[PDB]
Design a protein around this ligand. Structure first.
Ligand SMILES: [K+]
Ligand SMILES: [K+]
Ligand SMILES: [K+]
Ligand SMILES: [K+]
Ligand SMILES: [K+]
Ligand SMILES: [Mg+2]
Ligand SMILES: [Mg+2]
Ligand SMILES: [Mg+2]
Ligand SMILES: [Mg+2]
Ligand SMILES: [Mg+2]
Ligand SMILES: [Mg+2]
Ligand SMILES: [Mg+2]
Ligand SMILES: [Mg+2]
Ligand SMILES: [Mg+2]
Ligand SMILES: [Mg+2]
Ligand SMILES: [Mg+2]
Ligand SMILES: [Mg+2]
Ligand SMILES: [Mg+2]
Ligand SMILES: [Mg+2]
Ligand SMILES: [Mg+2]
Ligand SMILES: [Mg+2]
Ligand SMILES: [Mg+2]
Ligand SMILES: [Mg+2]
Ligand SMILES: [Mg+2]
Ligand SMILES: [Mg+2]
Ligand SMILES: [Mg+2]
Ligand SMILES: [Mg+2]
Ligand SMILES: [Mg+2]
Ligand SMILES: [Mg+2]
Ligand SMILES: [Mg+2]
Ligand SMILES: [Mg+2]
Ligand SMILES: [Mg+2]
Ligand SMILES: [Mg+2]
Ligand SMILES: [Mg+2]
Ligand SMILES: [Mg+2]
Ligand SMILES: [Mg+2]
Ligand SMILES: [Mg+2]
Ligand SMILES: [Mg+2]
Ligand SMILES: [Mg+2]
Ligand SMILES: [Mg+2]
Ligand SMILES: [Mg+2]
Ligand SMILES: [Mg+2]
Ligand SMILES: [Mg+2]
Ligand SMILES: [Mg+2]
Ligand SMILES: [Mg+2]
Ligand SMILES: [Mg+2]
Ligand SMILES: [Mg+2]
Ligand SMILES: [Mg+2]
Ligand SMILES: [Mg+2]
Ligand SMILES: [Mg+2]
Ligand SMILES: [Mg+2]
Ligand SMILES: [Mg+2]
Lengths: 14, 122, 87, 41, 149, 206, 26, 179, 46, 97
RNA sequence: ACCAAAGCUAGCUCAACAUACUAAACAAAUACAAAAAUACACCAAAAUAAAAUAAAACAUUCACCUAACAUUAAAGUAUAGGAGAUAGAAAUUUUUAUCCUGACGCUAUAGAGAUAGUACCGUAAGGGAAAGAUGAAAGAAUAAAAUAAAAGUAAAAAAAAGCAAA
RNA sequence: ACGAGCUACCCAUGAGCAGUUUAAAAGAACCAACUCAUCUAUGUGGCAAAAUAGUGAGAAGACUUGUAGGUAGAGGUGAAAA
RNA sequence: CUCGCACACGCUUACAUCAGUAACUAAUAAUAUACUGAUAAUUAACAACCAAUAAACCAAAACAACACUAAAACGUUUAUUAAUUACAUUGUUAACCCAACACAGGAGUGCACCAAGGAAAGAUUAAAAGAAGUAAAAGGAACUCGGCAAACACAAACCCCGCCU
């Protein structure tokens, strides 16, 4: 299948 | 996205959305779309004559204060209507049926300025 | 600034017109007739506490209207900013 | 009654005192020191 | 009046009268160039053109001619210490033009005093002299000068 | 104007709305809560302007006048007795005007001084037959009057001159009220001759 | 703040050792 | 008469300006209703001038001379409003006996709360109003669970507050064993 | 062909879909308001 | 593993306060009182735990029986989940079986 | 020698007692696109909870799982169950009042998520944090006291050969 | 429970297609705006969670496009690619 | 070297004046449309808001003369009513919006292609490898899965599968 793991974002407060 | 925690006013929406900022309407729309402004609905400010009036926005420091006694509905009655009722009762002229002579009014709609509906703004 | 007149800027087609296109052989004018609208009546000015404004409306209408007519006549004859006006 | 280890400073000092003369990161880091100290004995 | 309930109007109602107005007006210096007849006021949001015209003609007896008003938007960008927007209040600015040719110029409300300016200069001169006296002597080399010998 | 304060706050002999207080306490900080023994408003017998005696500190047995009281932390400030020295005028190339500053004292280190014997004495509030709350000493048994102190405004009503916008005392105390049964709306309308004929229609409220 | 007193006092034994090493007594 | 917005020219450059005390509540009860009407505008003209000076102070980046004058005037305005209102409600109680000058009744909104619904002025009755008939004053059965939950949330908040007061009393006694 | 910009702002659509009026017109919508009031949300709806 | 560098204020505990001196005074009320009150009638605490003992499962079940109708909504739901998990763990999991 | 280290309050948890249970604030505006004074209306509604699981599979069944009025016993008994898993009463019994309520509960990676459902990420339902430390006085900042102890660096780059040590 | 502000389709209401070739506004022809994305090379934590450069197909129609409304998961929608 | 002015939709003071930038923001410096503090501002004629009922009327927009097939948005007049009363309320800044970014991407209409708007190179040396562009002796597909790519070429014919857009 169309395997793809979307990236995550670091929280802005850091 | 958009800010959901701000004030929704007329400046944010499209041209169609035009919300007043709190003013009181003073008319309506006529036949041709020209705004017909009713003279009565305009608040006519009433001012007295202060030329011959001697009073100032400040009071002298040496003027003594007084015991803070809020006006009471009972104290007002004992000051205005009680002397009239007391004299009439002693003279035998008191009429429990009609109290209009002492300032009591049965229905408020007759007078120009109601009290319970609070007709006058200020 | 002219914005205190008040005057408001706008953008649309720039047109130079005389009442007819250039092909019309009648390229000059004789007189103009103007009728003041309802908002500029004498009675309206008195209510708004405007006495000297009665003559201002007449003067403002004539100066702006006649200049546009006379200016358009000159530019239909070819006269413009760099050619000035001969007659 | 939450019980926490407070003398952990002396827990690692009993190990590092035998690893003061090593070369590299084995003389500072505890995890690398224990494997070196155990092999030393 | 603001924060009050006006009476609903139908046909034949009596004239609406307000005796103690709740409105307050600030006279401000224009930030840009204005003509000779224009006076700039700051008015509360609940005030209309007709209210301001009656406000000046009756309370202050100022023969105004035309009144124009606009709504100003305050800054809502700066963040608090806890990263929360703090919004300045929005104020309504109204311009009026006098009728009988009366001319108004905004006066200078803070004229300096020649004596006060002289006194400030003397105080500054005294402080400068005191600093010079307190300045250490370079030839002493940092040795304290309080002791005699 | 009243300035709101955080639920936990520290007082340091500076008013909350001062620039010195903001410099000491930025709005984004909060510190440890000091233990303050609760004293009810009816148990605080120390005011400003009465002579008191200092028990503990570098100076003991001396007497002085109370100038400032911190009710929040139960502090009494004597006038230049428990003093430490600081500098006021500071700039790049000059320093000076060495001004002594008085440190705060707690209530337990300060005891009120009776006027007659000039010695410390415990004070208890007593209700006399005149209906006035007057402090009463324990040892001597003599009452102590309240320490009348000038207000923070610094203006004495005894010596005052009326300005252009100051109302005279006679006009301030002049009474012109006639208590009739007409509102302010009715009286002013009939006073100026304002005449209205028509009446409002029926309005439905819901 | 861990509850206890043995840990607090046993370190005072170490602080004295460091002071002697840094500034030996005459 | 446009100079009324500014103080007299002799006082423009003064760094400190003295003023008298504000009107107290008791002093205004001795004045007549006609007298209070005239005094309101005397205060009104004073307050406009102070606001103009205060704004001009920010423009010139200079402190406002004796800013406490504005605080005194606004206090006088509030006292004048209070005493006249003290005459309106007292007169209303004698004539009608209603506590509040705006009609209203307690209603239960869709959210289950109890809300004091003020009335509004309309030229048509309640049943002939399109907008009014769309508002709902009653709680649906599903609101019962959510109304119950709000009680639990408020109960825990008060329960935490009460236990906090007890802890402080014990803590202060240990550090102040004067008993 | 370049996703990521699926949100095209519009005040007419936002106030018609997530507005306060729509939340009070359906029985399920009112429960959404009740949940947010109980949770203590600063903004119940757009 | 950093430890505090200052000696804490030593706790001056008095062994002879009112609580410790009078601790466990009437533990023998039944023995020396004509057996009029069992010592279990002196326990102060929860309603469902006065003179009772059990493991974690029997305690949660007992709490639901007595004061179940007086608990809050959120507390009632959390108790039900705890009962179900303990019921499954005690019976369907373990080593000795 | 830098980076760092240390502190004990904020408040919380579990009960008990308990009034009897949607707080505080409501001047004006709030279900037109909420917080916009003002026009001929429509208004409203209910239908058993299901399944993840257990029976080492899974179809009948599977405690608690919305509505019990409790405790000591009868009793895990009678019964109900692909009679398997497991489910499970009653008749009949026991229960003396008020005070004695506080803590072998935590102390900033703990305790509520909370300084807070706020920042911030989502169109929306929803998800949801980190963050505090001087002293009696900082109206003692040429200000003061304290550990100078984590990894990482500096003071002080390296000299044949080797699980780095013995 | 919440989602058709991207996308599939539809209902409203609007707005675009210049020149050139032909009795043609003919799902004709050449070629822009405009819309799709054939081939190759760069790019592969990149400018970009699908792009840039060159080259290509349609370009008066079964065409592109703005605003706004409708269909919701046992379903919606589909000139079937599950 | 050339995507420029304006409106709608959106964003919400990020715009303007003055001062400061050791540090925060710009992926650097100068510095200030973008960071900090104070003060100030968008003024209506344009735009939003801006009557109801009954009756007569089969006859398209495409320069519309007159016609085609797919049969087409676009109203006047008569009658009965409509508060009649200067000045109502509201949108007017910007170097901007949606894409985690001050992103070589996405973005509707009118008018121009400029009179307007902008800067490919921070300073050097001129190695390999890699990317993009120009030119070439003799030969012209001998390359290679294929003439892919490139070219001073820009043509002709056959077959298979689908009719065609
Ligand atoms: K088991
Ligand atoms: K939709
Ligand atoms: K890009
Ligand atoms: K913006
Ligand atoms: K081949
Ligand atoms: Mg958001
Ligand atoms: Mg708008
Ligand atoms: Mg706009
Ligand atoms: Mg008009
Ligand atoms: Mg305007
Ligand atoms: Mg997204
Ligand atoms: Mg779109
Ligand atoms: Mg199974
Ligand atoms: Mg298993
Ligand atoms: Mg089940
Ligand atoms: Mg059977
Ligand atoms: Mg925490
Ligand atoms: Mg911890
Ligand atoms: Mg270290
Ligand atoms: Mg070797
Ligand atoms: Mg759509
Ligand atoms: Mg064409
Ligand atoms: Mg074609
Ligand atoms: Mg496609
Ligand atoms: Mg391309
Ligand atoms: Mg290319
Ligand atoms: Mg090429
Ligand atoms: Mg083509
Ligand atoms: Mg073709
Ligand atoms: Mg839906
Ligand atoms: Mg399907
Ligand atoms: Mg399709
Ligand atoms: Mg297929
Ligand atoms: Mg398939
Ligand atoms: Mg943004
Ligand atoms: Mg730059
Ligand atoms: Mg500058
Ligand atoms: Mg700025
Ligand atoms: Mg980038
Ligand atoms: Mg460059
Ligand atoms: Mg370079
Ligand atoms: Mg090369
Ligand atoms: Mg090459
Ligand atoms: Mg070539
Ligand atoms: Mg060649
Ligand atoms: Mg070959
Ligand atoms: Mg070959
Ligand atoms: Mg091939
Ligand atoms: Mg090719
Ligand atoms: Mg073949
Ligand atoms: Mg085909
Ligand atoms: Mg064929």
């Amino acid at each position: 299948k169309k395997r793809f793991t979307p990236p995550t974002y670091q929280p802005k407060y850091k | 996205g958009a800010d959901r925690m701000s004030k929704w006013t007329s400046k944010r929406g499209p041209r169609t959305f035009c919300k007043g900022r709190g003013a009181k309407g003073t008319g309506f729309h006529g036949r041709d779309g020209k705004f017909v402004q009713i003279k009565e609905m305009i608040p006519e400010l009433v001012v007295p004559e202060l030329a011959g009036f001697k009073l100032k926005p400040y009071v002298n420091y040496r003027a003594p204060e007084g015991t803070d006694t809020p006006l009471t509905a009972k104290q007002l009655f004992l000051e205005t209507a009680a002397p009239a009722i007391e004299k009439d009762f002693k003279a035998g002229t008191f009429d429990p049926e009609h109290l209009e002579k002492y300032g009591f009014e049965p229905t408020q709609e007759g007078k120009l300025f109601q009290l319970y509906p609070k007709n006058f703004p200020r | 600034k002219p914005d205190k007149l008040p005057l408001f800027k706008r953008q649309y087609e720039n047109t130079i017109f005389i009442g007819s296109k250039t092909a019309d052989p009648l390229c000059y004018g004789h007189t103009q007739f103007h009728l003041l609208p309802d908002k500029l009546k004498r009675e309206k000015l008195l209510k708004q506490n405007c006495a000297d404004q009665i003559e201002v409306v007449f003067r403002a209408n004539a100066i702006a209207s006649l200049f546009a007519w006379t200016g358009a006549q000159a530019m239909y004859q070819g006269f413009w900013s760099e050619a000035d006006v001969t007659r | 009654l939450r019980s926490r280890v407070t003398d952990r400073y002396w827990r690692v000092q009993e190990v590092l005192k035998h690893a003061r003369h090593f070369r590299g990161r084995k003389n500072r880091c505890y995890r690398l020191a224990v494997r070196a100290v155990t092999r030393a004995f | 009046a603001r924060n009050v309930l006006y009476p609903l109007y139908q046909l034949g109602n009596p004239q609406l009268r307000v005796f103690r107005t709740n409105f307050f007006i600030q006279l401000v210096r224009p930030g840009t160039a204005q003509p000779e007849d224009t006076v700039q006021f700051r008015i509360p949001m609940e005030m209309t053109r007709v209210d301001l015209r009656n406000y000046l003609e009756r309370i202050y007896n100022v023969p105004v001619a035309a009144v124009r008003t606009r709504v100003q938007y305050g800054s809502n960008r700066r963040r608090d210490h806890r990263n929360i927007r703090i919004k300045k209040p929005d104020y309504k600015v109204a311009y009026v033009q006098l009728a009988l040719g009366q001319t108004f110029t905004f006066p200078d409300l803070f004229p300096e005093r020649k004596g006060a300016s002289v006194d400030v200069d003397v105080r500054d001169q005294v402080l400068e002299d005191q600093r010079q006296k307190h300045s250490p002597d370079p030839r002493r080399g940092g040795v304290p000068g309080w002791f005699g010998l | 104007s009243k300035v709101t304060l955080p639920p936990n706050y520290r007082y340091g002999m500076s008013r909350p709305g001062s620039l010195s207080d903001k410099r000491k306490n930025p709005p984004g900080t909060r510190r440890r809560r000091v233990p303050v023994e609760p004293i009810s408003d009816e148990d605080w017998h120390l005011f400003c302007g009465d002579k008191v005696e200092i028990l503990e500190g570098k100076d003991a047995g001396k007497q002085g006048k109370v100038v400032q009281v911190i009710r929040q932390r139960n502090w009494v400030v004597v006038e230049g007795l428990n003093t430490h020295y600081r500098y006021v005028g500071k700039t790049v190339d000059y320093r000076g005007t060495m001004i002594p500053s008085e440190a705060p004292l707690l209530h337990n280190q300060v005891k009120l001084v009776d006027p007659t014997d000039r010695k410390p004495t415990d004070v208890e509030w007593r209700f006399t037959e005149a209906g006035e709350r007057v402090r009463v000493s324990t040892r001597s048994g003599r009452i102590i009057p309240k320490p009348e102190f000038p207000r923070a405004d610094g203006i004495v009503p005894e010596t005052w001159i009326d300005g252009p916008k100051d109302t005279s005392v006679e006009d301030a105390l002049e009474k012109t009220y006639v208590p009739r049964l007409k509102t302010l709306e009715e009286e002013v309308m009939e006073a100026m001759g304002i005449q209205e004929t028509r009446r409002h229609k029926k309005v439905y409220w819901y | 703040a861990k509850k206890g007193f043995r840990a607090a006092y046993r370190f005072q034994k170490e602080l004295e050792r460091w002071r002697l090493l840094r500034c030996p007594p005459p | 008469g446009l100079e009324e917005f500014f103080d007299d020219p002799k006082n423009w450059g003064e760094e400190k300006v003295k003023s008298g005390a504000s009107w107290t509540c008791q002093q205004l009860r001795n004045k007549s209703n006609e007298d209070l009407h005239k005094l309101w505008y005397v205060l009104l003209k004073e307050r406009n001038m102070l606001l103009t000076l205060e704004q001009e102070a920010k423009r010139q980046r200079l402190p406002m001379p004796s800013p406490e004058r504005l605080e005194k005037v606004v206090d006088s305005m509030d006292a004048l409003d209070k005493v006249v209102q003290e005459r309106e409600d007292a007169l209303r109680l004698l004539q009608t006996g209603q506590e509040k000058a705006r009609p209203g009744a307690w209603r239960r909104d869709i959210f289950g709360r109890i809300i004091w619904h003020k009335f509004k002025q309309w030229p048509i009755p309640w049943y002939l109003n399109k907008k009014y008939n769309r508002k709902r004053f009653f709680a649906m059965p599903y609101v019962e669970r959510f109304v119950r939950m709000r009680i639990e949330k408020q109960a825990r908040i008060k329960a935490r507050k009460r236990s906090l007061e007890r802890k402080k009393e014990k803590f202060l006694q240990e550090k102040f064993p004067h008993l | 062909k370049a996703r990521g910009n699926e949100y095209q702002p519009s005040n007419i659509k936002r106030k018609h879909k997530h507005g306060w009026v729509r939340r009070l017109r359906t029985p399920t919508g009112v429960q959404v308001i009740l949940r947010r009031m109980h949770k203590g949300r600063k903004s119940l709806s757009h | 593993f950093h430890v505090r560098v200052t000696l804490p204020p030593r706790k001056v505990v008095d062994r002879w306060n009112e609580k410790r001196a009078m601790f466990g005074v009437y533990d023998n009320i039944g023995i020396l009182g004509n057996f009029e009150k069992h010592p279990k009638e002196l326990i102060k605490g929860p309603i469902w735990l006065r003179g009772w003992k059990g493991n974690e499962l029997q305690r949660c079940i007992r709490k639901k029986r007595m004061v179940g109708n007086r608990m809050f909504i959120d507390d009632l739901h959390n108790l039900n989940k705890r009962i179900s998990y303990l019921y499954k763990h005690f019976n369907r999991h373990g080593k000795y079986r």
